[PDB]
Scaffold this active site. Sequence first.
Site, PDB file in Angstrom:
ATOM      1  N   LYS A   1       0.856  -1.184   0.000  1.00 60.01           N
ATOM      2  CA  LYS A   1       0.000   0.000   0.000  1.00 60.01           C
ATOM      3  C   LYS A   1       0.895   1.237   0.000  1.00 60.01           C
ATOM      4  O   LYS A   1       1.738   1.354   0.889  1.00 60.01           O
ATOM      5  CB  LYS A   1      -0.952   0.007   1.191  1.00 60.01           C
ATOM      6  CG  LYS A   1      -1.597   1.377   1.409  1.00 60.01           C
ATOM      7  CD  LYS A   1      -2.604   1.246   2.552  1.00 60.01           C
ATOM      8  CE  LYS A   1      -3.387   2.541   2.759  1.00 60.01           C
ATOM      9  NZ  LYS A   1      -4.573   2.250   3.629  1.00 60.01           N
TER      10      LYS A   1
ATOM     11  N   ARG B   1     -10.658  10.334   2.154  1.00 62.97           N
ATOM     12  CA  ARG B   1     -10.524  11.109   3.393  1.00 62.97           C
ATOM     13  C   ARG B   1     -11.834  11.807   3.723  1.00 62.97           C
ATOM     14  O   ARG B   1     -12.185  11.951   4.899  1.00 62.97           O
ATOM     15  CB  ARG B   1      -9.348  12.082   3.285  1.00 62.97           C
ATOM     16  CG  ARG B   1      -8.073  11.430   3.819  1.00 62.97           C
ATOM     17  CD  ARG B   1      -6.798  12.010   3.234  1.00 62.97           C
ATOM     18  NE  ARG B   1      -5.735  11.018   3.339  1.00 62.97           N
ATOM     19  CZ  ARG B   1      -4.424  11.256   3.345  1.00 62.97           C
ATOM     20  NH1 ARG B   1      -3.929  12.506   3.302  1.00 62.97           N
ATOM     21  NH2 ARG B   1      -3.596  10.220   3.438  1.00 62.97           N
TER      22      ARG B   1
ATOM     23  N   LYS C   1      -2.460  -1.632  -3.480  1.00 61.93           N
ATOM     24  CA  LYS C   1      -3.246  -0.401  -3.346  1.00 61.93           C
ATOM     25  C   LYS C   1      -2.370   0.828  -3.464  1.00 61.93           C
ATOM     26  O   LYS C   1      -1.395   0.872  -2.704  1.00 61.93           O
ATOM     27  CB  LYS C   1      -3.938  -0.350  -1.977  1.00 61.93           C
ATOM     28  CG  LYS C   1      -4.592   1.002  -1.678  1.00 61.93           C
ATOM     29  CD  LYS C   1      -5.387   0.882  -0.382  1.00 61.93           C
ATOM     30  CE  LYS C   1      -6.075   2.197  -0.025  1.00 61.93           C
ATOM     31  NZ  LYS C   1      -6.624   2.081   1.362  1.00 61.93           N
TER      32      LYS C   1
END
Lengths: 340, 340, 340, 340
Positions: free
Chosen positions: A210, A220, A263
């Site tokens: 990630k 977010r 990711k």
Amino acid sequence: MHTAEFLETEPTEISSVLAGGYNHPLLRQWQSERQLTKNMLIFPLFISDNPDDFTEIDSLPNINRIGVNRLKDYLKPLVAKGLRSVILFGVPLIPGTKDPVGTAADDPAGPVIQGIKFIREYFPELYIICDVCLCEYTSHGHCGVLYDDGTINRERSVSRLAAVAVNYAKAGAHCVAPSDMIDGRIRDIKRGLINANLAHKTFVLSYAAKFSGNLYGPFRDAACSAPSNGDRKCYQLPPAGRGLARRALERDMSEGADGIIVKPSTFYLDIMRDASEICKDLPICAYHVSGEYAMLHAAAEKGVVDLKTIAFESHQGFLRAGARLIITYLAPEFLDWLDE
Amino acid sequence: MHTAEFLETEPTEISSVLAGGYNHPLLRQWQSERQLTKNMLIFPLFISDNPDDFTEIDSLPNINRIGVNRLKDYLKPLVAKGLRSVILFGVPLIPGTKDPVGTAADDPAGPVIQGIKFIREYFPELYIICDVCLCEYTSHGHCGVLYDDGTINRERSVSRLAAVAVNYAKAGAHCVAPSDMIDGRIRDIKRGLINANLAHKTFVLSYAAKFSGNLYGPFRDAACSAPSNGDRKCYQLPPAGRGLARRALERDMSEGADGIIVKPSTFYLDIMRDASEICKDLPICAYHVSGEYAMLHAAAEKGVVDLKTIAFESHQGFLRAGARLIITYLAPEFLDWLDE
Amino acid sequence: MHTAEFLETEPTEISSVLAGGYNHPLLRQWQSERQLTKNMLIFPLFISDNPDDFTEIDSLPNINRIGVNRLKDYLKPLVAKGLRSVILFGVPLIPGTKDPVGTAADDPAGPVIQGIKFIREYFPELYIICDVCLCEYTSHGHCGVLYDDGTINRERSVSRLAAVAVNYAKAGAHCVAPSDMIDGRIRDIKRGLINANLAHKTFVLSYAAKFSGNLYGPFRDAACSAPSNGDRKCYQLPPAGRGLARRALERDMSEGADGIIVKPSTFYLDIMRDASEICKDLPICAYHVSGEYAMLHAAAEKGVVDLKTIAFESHQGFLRAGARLIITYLAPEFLDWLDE
Amino acid sequence: MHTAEFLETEPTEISSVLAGGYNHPLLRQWQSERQLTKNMLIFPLFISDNPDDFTEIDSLPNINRIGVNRLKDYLKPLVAKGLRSVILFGVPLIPGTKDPVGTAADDPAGPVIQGIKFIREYFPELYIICDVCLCEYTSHGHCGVLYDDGTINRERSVSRLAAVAVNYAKAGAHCVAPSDMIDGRIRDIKRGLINANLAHKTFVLSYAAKFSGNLYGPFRDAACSAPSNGDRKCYQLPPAGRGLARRALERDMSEGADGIIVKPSTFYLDIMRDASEICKDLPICAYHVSGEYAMLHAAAEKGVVDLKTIAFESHQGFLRAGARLIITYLAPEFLDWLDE
Ligand SMILES: [Zn+2]
Ligand SMILES: [Zn+2]
Ligand SMILES: [Zn+2]
Ligand SMILES: [Zn+2]
């Protein structure tokens, strides 16, 4: 006159001729090493601690923050179209919830565990994945427990995260997916599940590779997880860090991961390919993240690409690169598109 | 009270600890296997057959179609900021130019060869790459010569393309980059250069792994190269076709490629990684195509990403995946950004 | 007459023709797998315990032994030209300092820790590497603690070295680089940093493949580190010992190295190549040692080679062989040469 | 007081302990994968067309240009000390000898063929290698035949070189060593030897990985081979060109090389290591070139290194990197040093 010049040729070499393999639409399908099916799709849910919530997230197209009293109506049609799995993210908005050690991450009263119990009761065949991290629960927005100097405290963080993961498993989650990127958290989570007699029941889906970067913006907003003071660059991997990613994949496999997530996705397809060798015996999952998703919508809105076309192009990309699972905000679209 | 639970830990295993390698900004640079420098950049030029052209291409941000009388003023500041290479695309707009065999592709009076002679004279240190194909020159917009049934005629096409490539080399181009994807064209182009005594002077940069897809939209406007009746799916590779791409890379290496291009770029990073093994001894080039470029601008305009940030993220991605060269419409930006 | 004979030829085979790839200066750059940039350079500093020192080292051209009160003026222009990292070597000259266990190695009053605090204050963006060893601090000049028979005591040595490394980290060093070659010292240094809560902040740059040989002469003058009675051949690797070097690389990676150094450099390029497979996921650093450096100056002074030319040739050699970092006494020259 | 700190240790891990393998002088020999013997040495001879020559070459220490009437006295003591092989370089100084096609390269009256006949008669057990190239024989000093534009003409050059090689074989040379680096010359030389019924008798020792660079200075004096107008960078490999070198090794093996030379040596040890995989079934030879040799003498004269010590260090380096043969101007020294 300038006339069309044609150089003298030699007979065709058989080794030159690839075209026999892809001159029909069925063949361009034969050429895929893996085809997209509905059971490969994993759909993120953002669960609110207000049971009646269904809040639009302005920066994340067609995705809402949902409380438990709204879940049934939301999920019924998706399951009916073949949805097989969800990944839960808790978004506790009640004041005085967040603290420096993410106490609420495993609050039995909290949106994740309530969400687990709701889904186990009303949709008992749905496979429940829970994100495991502290960022949606810490006053400071970082993914672990901090030292006073604001750097991550590894030992305390993995101690806390192992607890959270086990507690989600105890509540009914089938799979835990630690997204924190803190050194050695998989070992401790796996040991925690072994001690709780749940390791034989709980898939550990590590976000092993990630990366830090510019593609998490809209997440977010949905998860209210933005850091306070600093960024995540000392634990999320640097975008250029192939070596680190390779080592992280090996590490998490060794420490007990049953599967791994790469990711972001499209911008890291080479790392999926790396993972397909290193983790050849494990399922590999692509996470099509908030910014990649919002980027496809923005370009489609501008007429640069066709949404459906590039959605298939990008998601086929994941499978080509070695993934066999996809976490994607486009799951509802694909549950309709794959019928046809 | 729900209190924060912390599971009992074992001592940290050294194998878990990756963080020593990336806790400072200089280290996140040490972790790249290749750093971006200005000499890696290759900038596309669209040359018009109207010498005074400087036409905006609405779908391709900040890029114009340029005639020869405008080239000097355009290129002088770029070279001054360190531009080392360009890739030329001809865009002949004079009526009665295009025909079924792309006669004008190597018209000495045409924009590419005029463009070559201009650049050799006024910018003698610039490295000139020429795209080689027929699509900007055929009445039907396909990349090769067709049979009556409208399918590609391999033998005639590679015969024509070999001529074009050699003629560009004869005019002064340092490198030819065949973008047609027709079986065996590299062999014939290389044999053509050998027969012309130019193979020791001319780099063959094959678009070896070039995929069909949804990301070439804005290029079709700049180059006026859209096909007539049908599409390019029987020669451009299918997006899922990893096997075909692997075979195409091996083939073109064997037939004389000095370097290879993977195209598109970001959406095919896994194929660059494949290429970095298959073509380990050759330079690998990423082509950041019109639709990928326009997608980054669209998302930045929508506030999804920061343009500079994601430009560095994506281009660092290419290097991470094994490329050492980048064809990119963002070259002017990078010639400024890499100073700082 | 003897006349020039020409044998009858066959047509050129395409597989024979490499020349298309390197017939222009830009191409000979395209052919490098890594290009030299300023941030790859690491410059050694020899810090005196006399704060006002700036002593010439006769056998090490253009390099001095420097006290702290002279550091600012020395480093300011280098940092201004882009210096990113230094490696510190302490040279304590005050009598009654050296002893059998290298007590002064981590003297807070000593040149290394004073040097660290000075650089953290006046050049806070500089990345500080500290050499870790006992030889500059032992009465006998060996790199570890000795048994009475004068052979190395492994356990005591690594115990001492782990302390030193942690103490430098505690003082502010970003990276520790153990140059002692004593079995298992990386494990203990890494465990020491873990126990001190500094492993997440401190890069461990092991001199993993460091050979005994004839090329350290001028270093012994700069660092006043020459052994007393015997030599270093039972711990520094034998020059012919490829197997040992391979095993040492694997070992130190396994014990926690974030990066490795091959030393010397030019005379051991094959070991860098070995390391680039074994340690493929880690940064590899070449150390261009005192004798290799002084050799280039001696040959240039004799007119055998051109200094700048062979400096680029040798340093490009390191990158070709798989290094991405270079410790080199020619860093000041390269911070000027790489502008042009 | 600052006291010596010793961190608490864990028991030694067996995997840490390498020292058992190299604690005695005999063991440091056991650790070599190949030991230096006299029959590995190949000594260059520069033969003048003045039969009475014995001219000092100022830039090449202790090496002279020798005519045939002086050869016997020169070689007798060397053979007596175990010299097994020589490599001949012709240096024709008679005016009106050099021409654009290197006519004199295979002049039966010339120094190489005279040198071959002399050595076959007076030292019938000596193994004779002949350098094959045109540079010592062309008016322009390049290694092949040129086009009018001064670039290399491949076809004519390999045609000429094949003749030269066969003619040396016809005169009695046991081995031909083409040092020209022109594409495909090995195929033509091998075909030439097959047609002449000499391929079963003649070892083809290709300079397969020969780099351009700064280390051939003193050779240009000995052989009077400096180019006229330009340099050798379009055929000698670029120093950073690992990919090209790998491809050149594969190519020359495929085209008939019985052995390969890597040149220069010390500065290219990584390429020997590459070659030891690619050409694992073939003898690999290091050429310790004029500039590397003169560099060792210059540094020794300056007291940087000890000549004998660094000679052994460097030559052991070649064997470590995979060579089993060494062309070296230090052969006379080693025929004495290896007794002891
Ligand atoms: Zn988090
Ligand atoms: Zn085309
Ligand atoms: Zn030491
Ligand atoms: Zn030559």
